[PDB]
Ligand binder design. Sequence first.
Ligand SMILES: OC[C@H]1O[C@H](O)[C@H](O)[C@@H](O)[C@H]1O
Ligand SMILES: OC[C@H]1O[C@H](O)[C@H](O)[C@@H](O)[C@H]1O
Ligand SMILES: OC[C@H]1O[C@H](O)[C@H](O)[C@@H](O)[C@H]1O
Ligand SMILES: OC[C@H]1O[C@H](O)[C@H](O)[C@@H](O)[C@H]1O
Ligand SMILES: OC[C@H]1O[C@H](O)[C@H](O)[C@@H](O)[C@H]1O
Ligand SMILES: OC[C@H]1O[C@H](O)[C@H](O)[C@@H](O)[C@H]1O
Ligand SMILES: [Mg+2]
Lengths: 151, 150
Amino acid sequence: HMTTFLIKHKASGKFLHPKGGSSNPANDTNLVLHSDIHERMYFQFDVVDERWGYIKHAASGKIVHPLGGKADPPNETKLVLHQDRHDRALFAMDFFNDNIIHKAGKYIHPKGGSTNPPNETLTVMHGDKHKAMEFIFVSPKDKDKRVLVYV
Amino acid sequence: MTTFLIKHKASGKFLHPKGGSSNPANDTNLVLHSDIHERMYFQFDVVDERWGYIKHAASGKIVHPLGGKADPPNETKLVLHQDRHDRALFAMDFFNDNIIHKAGKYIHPKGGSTNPPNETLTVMHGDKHKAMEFIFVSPKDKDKRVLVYV
Ligand SMILES: OC[C@H]1O[C@H](O)[C@H](O)[C@@H](O)[C@H]1O
Ligand SMILES: OC[C@H]1O[C@H](O)[C@H](O)[C@@H](O)[C@H]1O
Ligand SMILES: OC[C@H]1O[C@H](O)[C@H](O)[C@@H](O)[C@H]1O
Ligand SMILES: OC[C@H]1O[C@H](O)[C@H](O)[C@@H](O)[C@H]1O
Ligand SMILES: OC[C@H]1O[C@H](O)[C@H](O)[C@@H](O)[C@H]1O
Ligand SMILES: OC[C@H]1O[C@H](O)[C@H](O)[C@@H](O)[C@H]1O
Ligand SMILES: [Mg+2]
């Protein structure tokens, strides 16, 4: 069993989407911020090892990858969806500090770091911590109710 | 139903029911002790998102602030008790490595030592520091962290 949830950008109220909102995004489709809510921006978290797991797009089964699948992606590495499952797509959903951390230690950011980015803004990896990289994980039926993604 | 050990990060001691009984009486103190055995295994029963009950596996008793108050003061002793209610809600913060009560204070060793001796009591205190950090590990591998939210 896996709780279905929305990944909500705390500062803007926007959500993580595959660019274009497809039920089956092509491999390497970018992960962007968008204000819309619908079935094709639902996500699930597939726990792999304690805190580490795959951030899975619910509609397609593709998971979030740093583009290129490198072990230690540099700052500004774009985030995309890809079907492959391996250790470089491992993230942890820190619901206490409200962020999404990659196994190599960087966080998911809006590209450019705005607290209030436009729709379709890309998301990237970056080592910095500030309030524009905060995310909470909420019920698809109530965007203000936090849900436990680890069950 | 994952079973885990609650390991005091700085010393490597573990939370025990005082006395090591598989059947601790109500209001038995939670203490730190170096020994490992099934009578110090814990479970976590999720109630509401991050909040749940910290449960002594062998007895089913859960962790309470002594007195069951909703907003216990600093130095309130932590004990085991069978009752289930909202004043016994905790979250297991495995990212910052601490155990936080619903009202915002944390589980500490009494006195705040990074190396508390065996039988040191545990208490609630609002401060954050190295000596109140806990990690949650596998009974078959005291260095492998396990997910308690299950
Ligand atoms: O790029 C993301 C964006 O794509 C499409 O335009 C959809 O219609 C939107 O709802 C959103 O999912
Ligand atoms: O872009 C991400 C994607 O592409 C890489 O080159 C890898 O081969 C895949 O496993 C996946 O990580
Ligand atoms: O692209 C993401 C990046 O954008 C800006 O440069 C910010 O200052 C960084 O902290 C980070 O958020
Ligand atoms: O108080 C804790 C302590 O209690 C008893 O002495 C047990 O033998 C120990 O292993 C430990 O559980
Ligand atoms: O020691 C804790 C204990 O405190 C009170 O007496 C309550 O009535 C119990 O439910 C329990 O919480
Ligand atoms: O007993 C608990 C308490 O002990 C000391 O006062 C420490 O300074 C506090 O930070 C706390 O750990
Ligand atoms: Mg119960």
